[PDB]
C-alpha cells in the first residue's frame, strides 16, 4: 500500500531485517522531558 515512508523512522535492527533504509537525514538520540519547577524565588519576606 506504500512504496516509501518519508517520516521519522529510527534506524533499528528489527526494522532493518525486512526493509532497507537510507543514510540518515538527521542524527539524534533519546532524552528525558520533565516539568520545570519554581520559576523564581518567592522572597515574600524582604527581611528573610
Amino acid at each position: 500500500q506504500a512504496d516509501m515512508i518519508v517520516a521519522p523512522l529510527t534506524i533499528n535492527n528489527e526494522r532493518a531485517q525486512y526493509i532497507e533504509f537510507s543514510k540518515p537525514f538527521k542524527y539524534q538520540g533519546l532524552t528525558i522531558l520533565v516539568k520545570k519547577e519554581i520559576p523564581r524565588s518567592t522572597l515574600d519576606s524582604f527581611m528573610q
Binding site: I11, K23, P24, Y27
Partner: protein, 51 residues
Amino acid sequence: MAIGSLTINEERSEIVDFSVPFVETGISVMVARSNGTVSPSAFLEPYSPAV
C-alpha cells in the same frame, strides 16, 4: 575492507559502498580560549524594567 576513520562522502560512495555509520562526524572549528567577559549592560541588566 578498509576499516578506520574513513568519512562517508559522495564521490567515494559512487565506486565503493560503505556500511552504516557508527560515529558522528562533520566539520568544525577549534580556537584558543581567551579571558572571560561580562555583558556591558551589567550595571542594569540584572534588573527588570518593572523595578
